Design a protein around this motif. Structure first.
Motif, PDB file in Angstrom:
ATOM      1  N   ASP A  73       2.010  -0.425   6.955  1.00  0.00           N
ATOM      2  CA  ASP A  73       1.486   0.699   6.155  1.00  0.00           C
ATOM      3  C   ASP A  73       0.183   0.319   5.452  1.00  0.00           C
ATOM      4  O   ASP A  73      -0.047   0.612   4.282  1.00  0.00           O
ATOM      5  CB  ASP A  73       2.526   1.257   5.166  1.00  0.00           C
ATOM      6  N   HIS A  75      -2.613   1.749   6.146  1.00  0.00           N
ATOM      7  CA  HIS A  75      -3.215   3.066   5.859  1.00  0.00           C
ATOM      8  C   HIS A  75      -4.714   2.979   5.576  1.00  0.00           C
ATOM      9  O   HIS A  75      -5.204   3.430   4.515  1.00  0.00           O
ATOM     10  CB  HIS A  75      -2.422   3.769   4.703  1.00  0.00           C
ATOM     11  N   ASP A 109       1.617   2.351  10.908  1.00  0.00           N
ATOM     12  CA  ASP A 109       0.827   3.066   9.930  1.00  0.00           C
ATOM     13  C   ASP A 109      -0.441   2.333   9.499  1.00  0.00           C
ATOM     14  O   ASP A 109      -0.750   2.147   8.295  1.00  0.00           O
ATOM     15  CB  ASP A 109       1.686   3.418   8.694  1.00  0.00           C
TER      16      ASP A 109
HETATM   17 ZN   LIG Z   1       3.010   4.775   5.765  1.00  0.00          ZN
END
Ligand SMILES: [Zn+2]
Ligand SMILES: [Zn+2]
Length: 331
Positions: A73, A75, A109
């Motif tokens: 994650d 991102h 992600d």
């Molecule tokens: Zn995420």
């Protein structure tokens, strides 16, 4: 103004072509023998040497791996990812792989929310190749935002990428389409893997998996073949529906529910013959264990853009790797 890219088009035969956003204008270069070189006046966007090897499909189950690092994650927060891997000595200060024959699992992600998505992707592509050169491996798993971006669900893409889509005249999903280098690389990746006695995926495995008598290999192959399909076709197939939507491996948050039980977790652990499940997707303030460390959460909120942490599995210990370089044993 923006600097962004490259977006590389790689045809079935011939040379690839790189699109660069430089001061809110488009520059396009022909790639000469796999070297992706930045044009003039274009900031210091990443340069890469293309690799065929790392777009090959790899196994989803591994035995005897002495050391593993896991995180998730990112991102689009490249600065945070780089600093964390530097602090934890996974890379050298040059940003090159320094983890030897270790394996890294990035549980999904990389895309969305953040403003350095292509820096993250090209950095992970580079690391993927360097790890292999050292006898180690990077496992780039597909998270729900990889699936959303490749499939055309563009709700969480940072505003800055409107410049690239406008100038290159492609919607963002096709900036990572099947005729792009990064799109091909992603389409080679797994979604669920098993290393030693640990299972790794973005969201988590629900009891529905067992009901459906799924296997790692069957799910990973279907994820690859359908990440491109429409929602309606995904919706239409009972099994793709399970795999791609809320109770499936990349969206399920059940391990984080205050009502989920160790008893139910134990049936999942028994099913896969594993002692731990490592998941991202549901963001925590740090790497932490649940259910007597049977679940380890490795979404450490890198997405917020200030800090993050990793998990190290080595010498039969579970170790939390902090952003400041320190370590704490979880188990
Ligand atoms: Zn995420
Ligand atoms: Zn997620």
């Amino acid at each position: 103004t923006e600097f962004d890219g490259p977006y590389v088009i790689t045809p079935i035969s011939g040379q690839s072509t790189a699109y660069w956003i430089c001061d809110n204008r488009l520059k396009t270069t022909s790639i000469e023998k796999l070297q992706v070189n930045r044009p003039e006046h274009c900031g210091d966007l990443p340069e890469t040497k293309l690799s065929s090897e790392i777009k090959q499909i790899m196994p989803d189950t591994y035995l005897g791996i002495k050391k593993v690092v896991a995180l998730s994650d990112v991102h689009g927060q490249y600065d945070v990812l780089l600093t964390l891997l530097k602090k934890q000595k996974i890379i050298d200060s040059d940003g090159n792989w320094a983890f030897g024959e270790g394996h890294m699992v990035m549980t999904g992600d990389m895309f969305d929310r953040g403003h350095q998505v292509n820096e993250v992707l090209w950095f992970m592509y580079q690391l993927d190749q360097q790890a292999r050169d050292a006898g180690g491996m990077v496992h780039l798993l597909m998270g729900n935002h990889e699936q959303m971006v490749l499939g055309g669900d563009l709700r969480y893409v940072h505003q800055r990428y409107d410049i690239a889509t406008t100038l290159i005249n492609r919607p963002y999903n096709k900036l990572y389409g099947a005729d792009t280098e990064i799109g091909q690389w992603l389409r080679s990746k797994n979604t669920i893997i098993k290393i030693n006695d640990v299972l790794y995926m973005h969201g988590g495995i629900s009891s529905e998996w067992i009901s459906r008598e799924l296997t790692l290999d069957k799910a990973n192959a279907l994820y690859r073949a359908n990440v491109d399909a429409s929602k309606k076709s995904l919706k239409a197939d009972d099994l793709l529906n399970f795999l791609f939507f809320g109770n499936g491996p990349t969206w399920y948050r059940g391990y984080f529910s205050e009502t989920f039980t160790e008893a139910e977790l134990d049936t999942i652990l028994q099913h896969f013959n594993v002692n731990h499940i490592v998941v991202g997707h549901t963001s925590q303030e740090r790497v932490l264990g649940l259910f007597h460390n049977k679940v380890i959460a490795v979404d450490s909120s890198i997405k917020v853009g200030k800090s993050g942490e990793l998990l190290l599995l080595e010498n039969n210990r579970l170790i939390r790797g902090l952003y400041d370089g320190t370590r704490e044993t979880l188990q």
